[PDB]
Amino acid sequence: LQGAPGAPGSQGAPGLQGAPGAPGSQGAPGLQGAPGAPGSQGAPGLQGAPGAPGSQGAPGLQGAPGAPGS
Amino acid sequence: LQGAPGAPGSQGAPGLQGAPGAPGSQGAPGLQGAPGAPGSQGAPGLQGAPGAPGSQGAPGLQGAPGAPGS
Amino acid sequence: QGAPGAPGSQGAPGLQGAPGAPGSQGAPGLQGAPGAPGSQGAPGLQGAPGAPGSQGAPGLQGAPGAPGS
Amino acid sequence: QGAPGLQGAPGAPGSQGAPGLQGAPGAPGSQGAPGLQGAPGAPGSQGAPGLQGAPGAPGSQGAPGLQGAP
Amino acid sequence: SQGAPGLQGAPGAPGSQGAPGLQGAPGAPGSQGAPGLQGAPGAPGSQGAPGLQGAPGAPGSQGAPGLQGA
Amino acid sequence: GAPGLQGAPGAPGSQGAPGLQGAPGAPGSQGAPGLQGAPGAPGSQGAPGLQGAPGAPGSQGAPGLQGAPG
Amino acid sequence: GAPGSQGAPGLQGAPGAPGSQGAPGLQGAPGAPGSQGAPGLQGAPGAPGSQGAPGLQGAPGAPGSQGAPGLQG
Amino acid sequence: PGAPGSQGAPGLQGAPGAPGSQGAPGLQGAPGAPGSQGAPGLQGAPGAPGSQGAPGLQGAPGAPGSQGAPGLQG
Amino acid sequence: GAPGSQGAPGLQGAPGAPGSQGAPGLQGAPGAPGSQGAPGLQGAPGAPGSQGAPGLQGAPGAPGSQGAPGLQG
Amino acid sequence: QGAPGLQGAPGAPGSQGAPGLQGAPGAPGSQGAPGLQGAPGAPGSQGAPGLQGAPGAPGSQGAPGLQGAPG
Amino acid sequence: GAPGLQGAPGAPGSQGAPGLQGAPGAPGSQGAPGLQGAPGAPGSQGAPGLQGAPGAPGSQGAPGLQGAPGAP
Amino acid sequence: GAPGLQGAPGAPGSQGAPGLQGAPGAPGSQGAPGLQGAPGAPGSQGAPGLQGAPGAPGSQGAPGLQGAPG
Amino acid sequence: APGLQGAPGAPGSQGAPGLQGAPGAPGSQGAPGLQGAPGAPGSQGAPGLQGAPGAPGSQGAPGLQGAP
Amino acid sequence: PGLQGAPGAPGSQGAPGLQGAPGAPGSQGAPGLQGAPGAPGSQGAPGLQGAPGAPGSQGAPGLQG
Amino acid sequence: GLQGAPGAPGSQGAPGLQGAPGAPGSQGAPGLQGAPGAPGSQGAPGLQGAPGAPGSQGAPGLQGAPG
Numbered sequence A, B: 001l002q003g004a005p006g007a008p009g010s011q012g013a014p015g016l017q018g019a020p021g022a023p024g025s026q027g028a029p030g031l032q033g034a035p036g037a038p039g040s041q042g043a044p045g046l047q048g049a050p051g052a053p054g055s056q057g058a059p060g061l062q063g064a065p066g067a068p069g070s
Numbered sequence C: 001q002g003a004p005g006a007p008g009s010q011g012a013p014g015l016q017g018a019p020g021a022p023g024s025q026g027a028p029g030l031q032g033a034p035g036a037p038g039s040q041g042a043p044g045l046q047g048a049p050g051a052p053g054s055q056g057a058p059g060l061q062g063a064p065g066a067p068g069s
Numbered sequence D: 001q002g003a004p005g006l007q008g009a010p011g012a013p014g015s016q017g018a019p020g021l022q023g024a025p026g027a028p029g030s031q032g033a034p035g036l037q038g039a040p041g042a043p044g045s046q047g048a049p050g051l052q053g054a055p056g057a058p059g060s061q062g063a064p065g066l067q068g069a070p
Numbered sequence E: 001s002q003g004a005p006g007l008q009g010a011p012g013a014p015g016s017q018g019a020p021g022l023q024g025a026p027g028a029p030g031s032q033g034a035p036g037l038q039g040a041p042g043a044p045g046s047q048g049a050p051g052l053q054g055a056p057g058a059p060g061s062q063g064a065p066g067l068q069g070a
Numbered sequence F, L: 001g002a003p004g005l006q007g008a009p010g011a012p013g014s015q016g017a018p019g020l021q022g023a024p025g026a027p028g029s030q031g032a033p034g035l036q037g038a039p040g041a042p043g044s045q046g047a048p049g050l051q052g053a054p055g056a057p058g059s060q061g062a063p064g065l066q067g068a069p070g
Numbered sequence G, I: 001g002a003p004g005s006q007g008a009p010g011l012q013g014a015p016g017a018p019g020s021q022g023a024p025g026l027q028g029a030p031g032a033p034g035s036q037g038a039p040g041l042q043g044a045p046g047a048p049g050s051q052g053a054p055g056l057q058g059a060p061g062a063p064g065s066q067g068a069p070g071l072q073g
Numbered sequence H: 001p002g003a004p005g006s007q008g009a010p011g012l013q014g015a016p017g018a019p020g021s022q023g024a025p026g027l028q029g030a031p032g033a034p035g036s037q038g039a040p041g042l043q044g045a046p047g048a049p050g051s052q053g054a055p056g057l058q059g060a061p062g063a064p065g066s067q068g069a070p071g072l073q074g
Numbered sequence J: 001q002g003a004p005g006l007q008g009a010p011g012a013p014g015s016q017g018a019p020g021l022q023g024a025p026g027a028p029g030s031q032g033a034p035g036l037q038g039a040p041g042a043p044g045s046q047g048a049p050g051l052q053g054a055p056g057a058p059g060s061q062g063a064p065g066l067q068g069a070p071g
Numbered sequence K: 001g002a003p004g005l006q007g008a009p010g011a012p013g014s015q016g017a018p019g020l021q022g023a024p025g026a027p028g029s030q031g032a033p034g035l036q037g038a039p040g041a042p043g044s045q046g047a048p049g050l051q052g053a054p055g056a057p058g059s060q061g062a063p064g065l066q067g068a069p070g071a072p
Numbered sequence M: 001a002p003g004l005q006g007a008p009g010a011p012g013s014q015g016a017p018g019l020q021g022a023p024g025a026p027g028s029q030g031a032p033g034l035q036g037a038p039g040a041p042g043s044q045g046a047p048g049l050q051g052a053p054g055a056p057g058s059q060g061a062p063g064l065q066g067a068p
Numbered sequence N: 001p002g003l004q005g006a007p008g009a010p011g012s013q014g015a016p017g018l019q020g021a022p023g024a025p026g027s028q029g030a031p032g033l034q035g036a037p038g039a040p041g042s043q044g045a046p047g048l049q050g051a052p053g054a055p056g057s058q059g060a061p062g063l064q065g
Numbered sequence O: 001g002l003q004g005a006p007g008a009p010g011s012q013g014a015p016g017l018q019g020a021p022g023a024p025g026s027q028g029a030p031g032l033q034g035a036p037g038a039p040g041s042q043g044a045p046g047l048q049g050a051p052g053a054p055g056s057q058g059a060p061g062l063q064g065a066p067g
Helices: none
Strands: M005-007 N005-007
Touching: none
Parallel strands: M005 N005
Antiparallel strands: none
């Protein structure tokens, strides 16, 4: 008999994986930001009182001047 | 009679390289994960008396005693 | 009788099918640094200099000249 | 009478599996919508400086007269 | 007449054997979030009041306008 | 001598065997927030402070009358 | 006689049909929608009222209002 | 002569029933995703404009010079 | 005896039929950047200016007052 | 007769596989939000009362003690 | 007669891969930062203090015009 | 002399359109785009903290004289 | 009588090669340094002394008589 | 009788005959590197009052006359 | 027992693809947007307020009261 005919063998589909790997996305929530951190200002911050004067009870006052007359 | 009585049979084919792609990865990404906030607003309040209430020295008076005569 | 050889692609043609897991890329990580102004306030002008002055100074005109005899 | 050992056909050295995708899942942060600053504060218009009359020195300035001769 | 066959090749499996590979599906598309945002008032400390002269007056208390008596 | 070649049980096989499907899908998220937070109450109003009224006390001694020794 | 009868058939195989519908993805980037608003430029009227100097000046009330200036006698 | 036993009746030969769609027939649904827009910043200015004028004109400054009112002069 | 029996013209390939070849999964359509909108009302839009501008530190010439009522003669 | 005929009806096609794959459109540039506003300050000339021009009585020159010409 | 038979011949060529439309390689986007806005100088507006706060009155408090009898 | 033509046409592995045919050509730009519009922050200008010049004549002369220079 | 048939392995099947597989494909660039846009917004260089706030003068004797 | 048709062994002529280049960007990264802007030369206000002293009239009246 | 072998290609791997044709693709950088040379502002001094004159005011000279 002629047993030569054997046809293709158990061909290899599952053999070998092309190139595995997750997609490229990995990261972290960014990096250095900038100043912030709200706070306060301090309300009354304009000219205070240029020489805020004081109690002026009486100016130059001629107190009962004496007039020598004997 | 005869002519191919051998047995070349079936030869198991090799496995094709799978689909190749660029490996990657994923995580907890983003941006501004370090919001610095050195602004830290703390501006001071007033830097002096409220209105700098004057009328303070109060040196007012006639002057020397009022000693008249004649 | 007859000469039938091993027919078909017997000799392990091979690499017919790709059993892979192709990736796309590696890792486009964090992107943006910025995102905060910085507005630390400043101490405004002095509240007020409390009570400078006091012009109350009298003239001291306390009966100049000897009082009349 | 025996002779023709009809060559068995190698089908495939594969396996009856299903697409196995979840190779190593789990690299999340569930996004970041709470982005480290949310902290709504609703601040504004603190204590009003109801600055008012600072009484310096009320007065009348009584009237000197000439009709006190005894 | 009749013989005996055999010589069956690799019958690995008529399947699709799927083995997961590496890092994939967790809970990425979750959106999430709570501190959405804030912002609007920024109201400076309530406008308290401008000041006023609390108790003005008229100084004096000497008089004696050309007085020769009392 | 050599009978009809009986038959080859087709070795059950179809290959495939994905084997590795790394990075199944959406492998983790992070960073999808809103605006901001942590606002502070702006400093109080900058209105004029208590105006210390004039240091003009009640003048009462000014009335001296007098006028003549008798 | 006759050439015997049928020797060896085949039946390919039962239709797998559209290959097993694989694993779809999830929302592409299902981020929290809507432009996140920020504080208004000048939201709260902390002090948009009188922003000048609507005051007065000291002519009246305590003006040059002395008593008797004096004269002969 | 008889019947040695032939080979016929080929039920199926190369018309593959099993292959239905192959090539990953249909990519399973791609869920449309939402997302925020260009999140607005400063919008809304019903506040102090930023023009605090000045200390309202001092109502009671400027002692108006008086007539003196010294007194009689004999 | 044994009339010539065909041993091949009958069949032409017997089985075959790959099967079901897993369909793929479309990944969700992307979204958009950020969290929700709503500019909000609890920030710090810093109203500058103040009602210290009103001022109005009195009205009359309060400083002077004077009025010491001398005589004239 | 040594052998009969045969007919090898063509066999080869019908195996539409798949070489490497596209991956489809990854994602578009996600414009964020702009940084944040610049430094602080109440826009304007932060003026402040300098000082008086009227030392006490402005230009009154009262001459306290001015002669009343009491002839 | 004489024998004879053949196998493998007859194949029409396996259906080749049409491939993929366009180019593969799913790209990946990223998050744009933003611009820090125009700045400002901490301070305020104002000024009017020209007569900020009166000082000592010239050479005397206020109009005196006092005199006293000195002539006949 | 009757031969038998080919009976087992050698079938190699066919190929086809790989899976997702969509050329990625990813949406938009595939990156962190340009920074958004810098929000112009306000800010004060030069603080005129010194007016001190009202044209006021604040001044006096000198005690005139004893009176009626004779 | 019959001989045999043509058995050309794959005349014309191939011979044309396929473009080089897997080029690292050089010649790229991105995120060129930082795009900081350095320009000092307002002449970063410290400015000079701002307009000097002139102090008031000072004057001695306008005239003294004392003893004539 | 007697022939082999056209037997010369199975010449494949090869196989990978269309294209192999996936392509790639190359040497990522460009110079750029500006450094971010500066700021406005912050005029630190003027000074003030170099010598206000006593603008007036120190007549210094004499005596005994 | 005759045989005539007209012939056939025999065996080949001619195409064999190749490796790395050379930049069949490229990444153009976003360039250097802005203007390099990172500056930073600085504070100006203040002109010493124009000195009017150090203390010279006083009491104008009138007389010395010979009496």
